[PDB]
Amino acid sequence: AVVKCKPTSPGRRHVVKVVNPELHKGKPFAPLLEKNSKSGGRNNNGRITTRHIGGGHKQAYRIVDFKRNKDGIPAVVERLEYDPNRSANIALVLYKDGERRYILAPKGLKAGDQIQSGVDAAIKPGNTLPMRNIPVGSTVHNVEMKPGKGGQLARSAGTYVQIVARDGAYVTLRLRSGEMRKVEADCRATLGEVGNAEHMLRVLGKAGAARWRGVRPTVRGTAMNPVDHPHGGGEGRNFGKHPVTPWGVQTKGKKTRSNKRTDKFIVRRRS
Amino acid sequence: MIREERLLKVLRAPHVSEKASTAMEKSNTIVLKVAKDATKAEIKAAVQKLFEVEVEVVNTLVVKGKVKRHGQRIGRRSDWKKAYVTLKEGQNL
Amino acid sequence: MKRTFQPSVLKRNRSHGFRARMATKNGRQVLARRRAKGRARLTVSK
RNA sequence: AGGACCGAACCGACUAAUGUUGAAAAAUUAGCGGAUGACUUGUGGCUGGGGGUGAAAGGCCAAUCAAACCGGGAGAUAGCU
RNA sequence: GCUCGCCGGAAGACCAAGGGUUCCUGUCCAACGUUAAUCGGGGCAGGGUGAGUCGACCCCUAAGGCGAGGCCGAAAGGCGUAGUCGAUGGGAAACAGGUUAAUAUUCCUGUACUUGGUGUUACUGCGAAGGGGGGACGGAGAAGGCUAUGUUGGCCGGGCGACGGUUGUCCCGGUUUAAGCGUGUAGGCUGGUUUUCCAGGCAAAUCCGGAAAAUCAAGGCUGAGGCGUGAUGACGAGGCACUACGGUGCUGAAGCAACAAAUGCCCUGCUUCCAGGAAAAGCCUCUAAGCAUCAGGUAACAUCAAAUCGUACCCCAAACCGACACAGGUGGUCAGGUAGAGAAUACCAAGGCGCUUGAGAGAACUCGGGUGAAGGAACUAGGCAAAAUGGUGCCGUAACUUCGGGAGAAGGCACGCUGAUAUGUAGGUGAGGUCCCUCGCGGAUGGAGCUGAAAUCAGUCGAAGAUACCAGCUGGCUGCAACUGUUUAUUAAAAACACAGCACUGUGCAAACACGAAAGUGGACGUAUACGGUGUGACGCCUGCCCGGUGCCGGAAGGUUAAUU
Ligand SMILES: [Mg+2]
Ligand SMILES: [Mg+2]
Ligand SMILES: [Mg+2]
Ligand SMILES: [Mg+2]
Ligand SMILES: [Mg+2]
Ligand SMILES: [Mg+2]
Ligand SMILES: [Mg+2]
Ligand SMILES: [Mg+2]
Ligand SMILES: [Mg+2]
Ligand SMILES: [Mg+2]
Ligand SMILES: [Mg+2]
Ligand SMILES: [Mg+2]
Ligand SMILES: [Mg+2]
Ligand SMILES: [Mg+2]
Ligand SMILES: [Mg+2]
Ligand SMILES: [Mg+2]
Ligand SMILES: [Mg+2]
Ligand SMILES: [Mg+2]
Ligand SMILES: [Mg+2]
Ligand SMILES: [Mg+2]
Ligand SMILES: [Mg+2]
Ligand SMILES: [Mg+2]
Ligand SMILES: [Mg+2]
Ligand SMILES: [Mg+2]
Ligand SMILES: [Mg+2]
Ligand SMILES: [Mg+2]
Ligand SMILES: [Mg+2]
Ligand SMILES: [Mg+2]
Ligand SMILES: [Mg+2]
Ligand SMILES: [Mg+2]
Ligand SMILES: [Mg+2]
Ligand SMILES: [Mg+2]
Ligand SMILES: [Mg+2]
Ligand SMILES: [Mg+2]
Ligand SMILES: [Mg+2]
Ligand SMILES: [Mg+2]
Ligand SMILES: [Mg+2]
Ligand SMILES: [Mg+2]
Ligand SMILES: [Mg+2]
Ligand SMILES: [Mg+2]
Ligand SMILES: [Mg+2]
Ligand SMILES: [Mg+2]
Ligand SMILES: [Mg+2]
Ligand SMILES: [Mg+2]
Ligand SMILES: [Mg+2]
Ligand SMILES: [Mg+2]
Ligand SMILES: [Mg+2]
Ligand SMILES: [Mg+2]
Ligand SMILES: [Mg+2]
Ligand SMILES: [Mg+2]
Ligand SMILES: [Mg+2]
């Protein structure tokens, strides 16, 4: 639930927590874990290529099954779990043959539920089917872009995709951004929407809270000298410029998409 | 087995000092100046052969040479190795 | 007052040692220059 | 419970006096701030000069920084002393 | 040598880094030492560092480096696969006493332990570059059980006091002992066993995972400490002898108990929270190819091996970084007494020092301090500096408020010692004894002894009882910034930066964007509840009009317009 803290110190006054009692309390499933070290936003030349990244809490990577291609074998949900690496919760499922896998937890899922994937899976939340077999109008998540590649669309907490039309070998999706897009009907999707939909009601409350997530401070350009940023300089607070990125490109309205390879699939931009 | 040439050229000299004499009297130990690269096994074999005695064990240490000045120029004496050879309480060189 | 030279043998050898010099073309040029000059101590190793 | 409180170690550096050919090329003494955290510290590693890094002071990059240091072009040029 | 003073969470003792002979002995005093020097970290000569168990080396990996082929690049080169390196992390094993002028967990004495190779014997399904388990992991908090350690009593040895008293409820000293081995306790976790089956673990698997029955309910794992042994040993106050005066040799008493008690151990445990907390090997186990009365495996015994390098000395410092024998800097460990909440502070112990120029004098003036009549901010840019407040318990405490605060608001009272309550209380600890049982490191009862606040009453001394050291000045009005933080190393710490929150805008994933002639990499093993940029800056009430100018977004008829022809 959404819990407002008591203001017993200035750093607590505005904190709003998202508390889920259902999540597991113990350690995660060890066979499905690996190490991922932090980068600091540095690429392989050792240079900062994305700013405002660094520090934060150590995390381990939970191998999440995005393919969902273990067809025909039913599986049962064992427990919902906290995942450090994403905003959605993950569910540990046990297959009838003794295999265990992590999946994105859809909304409404709970321990003991049955899930299944394949062309003949029932139309239920958590069931994965090729979008050829999913009724038009359904809300799905973890959608694939190419057949067999793994879900890529609508993977964050509370997100979903709506199947709007089915015309031949292609379905038309309405993405969360509002964009209308075509994908092949052979791509799979998971029924229902991602859980943890109250993730956006949280309020970090204090600067340290954002530092715990690995976010470093942002220095405004207008607070620098001219040698550092196109916005720098001035005696007092001066701007007199059109706003731009640290590298000189207009930053309020100028469009940066340039991909002629994929424009065939974009039915309508997000507007 | 170690050849007799190596044994003939691993021992260099008997160390003579107050600690060496005390060790001989009390612990039945002789202190030797040995080749820089001789091992404990080689020292033990050479002592058993060239002096015809029976040895219990060998302890070794490397002594670092002193930096000296000989009329305004700095030299350095060479490192050398010494061995504490414990005999089998009946030999008494 | 913390001064600038804080000795560490491992770092000294890894940054200026003979094998760090020989690892690159420019390091080998450093060694060639110093041999031509006639330096008695070619690197920090000695 | 807490970027909670008072307060040593520890990390800082607000005031004053001294010192200013110093005990010291930035300290000392008396007070002062934080002191479970956006904390502090050891070891090793990465980022290289119109480049890095910067909770941004043009700050810092070996007592050097509105463009480091070393060598070279080089005996630059100097209607000036 | 005697006395005095100083440190004692260090100015003592160890380890790492760093240095490299500064360590010890003899000798010398030219130069060095801010003076003298017989002295020295100085000169000269000689001596000194002993390891199967400590560290490196070694096995294994992290970040990262290098990188066969490879991809990319005028050349040089860049990235990177298989690999191979890389500790600050994981991986076998030793303790006590003694000894040198200088080393000792290394030498000696006593008592141990680990790994590996061979050989003999007995039994026998062994085998990996593969599977599984394990190794293997956060912050905070709360106890309970312990020990290190201390105090007191008992015991043993000694004493009977330079000045009144001191055969006692007196004084001084000692009262120590390890690893290992046996025991498996306080406590923690976990149901056990058998059978059958199976789309899983790249193949197989008896192993792991899953499913179903039967049956038993106590079995397994982990574990400080104690106790026994180690140990009839060692050590031991002191005494006795020689001293060549530094010390050497010879004996050797008691060696117990209670209480208090850690920040150490059980504890990598338990409870809880969100920010969700390395890897790989050693290790256990399973099989594949393969082997097959071999090899190999298990167990007992015997025997051999455990190399090489470091080991002196300084190490909060005169030996390291600061040009100096320089008020500086420098990671980790140990941690006694009285008072105290305390690792603060004061005085001391063990231990270590008096800081490498002195001797006089007792002017101005400067530095660092003490006190001050009457006044009390009149000083000054400004209460700068100084003075003052300062503890614990209890009473009491306003506006305003985001209901938490404000608040230690403000203000006030008590405080020493002695006796009694009570020959030492409430409480804590807990022997003997008694009784039970699964006879044990057990349970119940029992309470000797030991330890022991706080309070009240009465008395009593002083000017003063939080007596020293230590230890908030308080209140009223107002600007700015919400707050904790950050910053001009070395004249600026702030109202500046950041911030949680808000908005706009870009981005459909081979994302936008950044680094890069490129290959690639970061974003991100993320997917619009996400990510980047820009502005604003908690919260409350709000955020009005202008699209002429300059940007940006959309349009695509018409005018103009490149290469080309
Ligand atoms: Mg950013
Ligand atoms: Mg922001
Ligand atoms: Mg500025
Ligand atoms: Mg500019
Ligand atoms: Mg202005
Ligand atoms: Mg203007
Ligand atoms: Mg030996
Ligand atoms: Mg050795
Ligand atoms: Mg605090
Ligand atoms: Mg100070
Ligand atoms: Mg404060
Ligand atoms: Mg404080
Ligand atoms: Mg400026
Ligand atoms: Mg500088
Ligand atoms: Mg320039
Ligand atoms: Mg020229
Ligand atoms: Mg010139
Ligand atoms: Mg004192
Ligand atoms: Mg010398
Ligand atoms: Mg000396
Ligand atoms: Mg003289
Ligand atoms: Mg002199
Ligand atoms: Mg000397
Ligand atoms: Mg690597
Ligand atoms: Mg190649
Ligand atoms: Mg490479
Ligand atoms: Mg390796
Ligand atoms: Mg290490
Ligand atoms: Mg010594
Ligand atoms: Mg005890
Ligand atoms: Mg502590
Ligand atoms: Mg030593
Ligand atoms: Mg001095
Ligand atoms: Mg000093
Ligand atoms: Mg420090
Ligand atoms: Mg103190
Ligand atoms: Mg005077
Ligand atoms: Mg004065
Ligand atoms: Mg007066
Ligand atoms: Mg007066
Ligand atoms: Mg007055
Ligand atoms: Mg006035
Ligand atoms: Mg006046
Ligand atoms: Mg003042
Ligand atoms: Mg004062
Ligand atoms: Mg005003
Ligand atoms: Mg502020
Ligand atoms: Mg400054
Ligand atoms: Mg300042
Ligand atoms: Mg990419
Ligand atoms: Mg602003």
Contact, A128 vs A59, CB < 8 A?
Answer: no
Distance from Cα A11 to the centre of ligand 18, integer Å: 47
User: Strands A266-268 and B11-14, how do they pair?
Assistant: unpaired
Distance from Cα A258 to the centre of ligand 4, integer Å: 26
Nearest to A186 by CA among A107, A110, A119, A113: A119
Quote the CA–CA distance of B30 and B23 in Å, as a whole number: 7
Q: Which CATH architecture has domain C1-46?
A: Orthogonal Bundle (1.10)
Provide, in whole angstroms, the distance separating residue B4's CA from nucleotide E118's C1'.
26
Contact, A229 vs A249, CB < 8 A?
Answer: no
Nucleotides on chain E within 7 angstroms of protein Cβ: 17-21, 43-52, 62-66, 76-77, 79-80, 87, 100-102, 106-108, 132-134, 136-137, 198-200, 208-210, 273-279, 306-311, 320-322, 328-330, 402-404, 482-484, 496-501, 504-516, 520-523, 525-539, 550-554
Which H helix or E strand runs over A164? strand A161-167
User: Residues for chain A: how many in total?
Assistant: 271
The Cα-based distances of A26 to A23, A80, A82, A91 in angstroms read: 9, 11, 10, 14
Note the ligand closest to the C-alpha atom of A227.
Answer: 4
Quote the CA–CA distance of A109 and A103 in Å, as a whole number: 11
Please report the resolution in angstroms: 2.4
Nearest to A196 by CA among A108, A125, A115, A78: A108
Which residue, chain included where needed, has tokens 């690996």?
A: A34
Domain layout of chain C by residue ranges: 1-46
Nearest to A133 by CA among A191, A88, A218, A176: A191
Report residues near ion ligand 2: CB below 5 Å: A 218
Method of structure determination: cryo-EM
Domains and CATH numbers, chain A: 1-113 (2.40.50.140), 117-194 (no CATH), 195-271 (4.10.950.10)
DSSP B41-90: HHHHHHHHHHS---EEEEEEEEEPPPEEESSS-EEEPPPEEEEEEEE-SS
Q: Considering only the top CATH level, what class is B2-93?
A: alpha beta
Domain layout of chain B by residue ranges: 2-93
Quote the CA–CA distance of A138 and A152 in Å, as a whole number: 18
Distance from Cα C33 to the centre of ligand 3, integer Å: 46
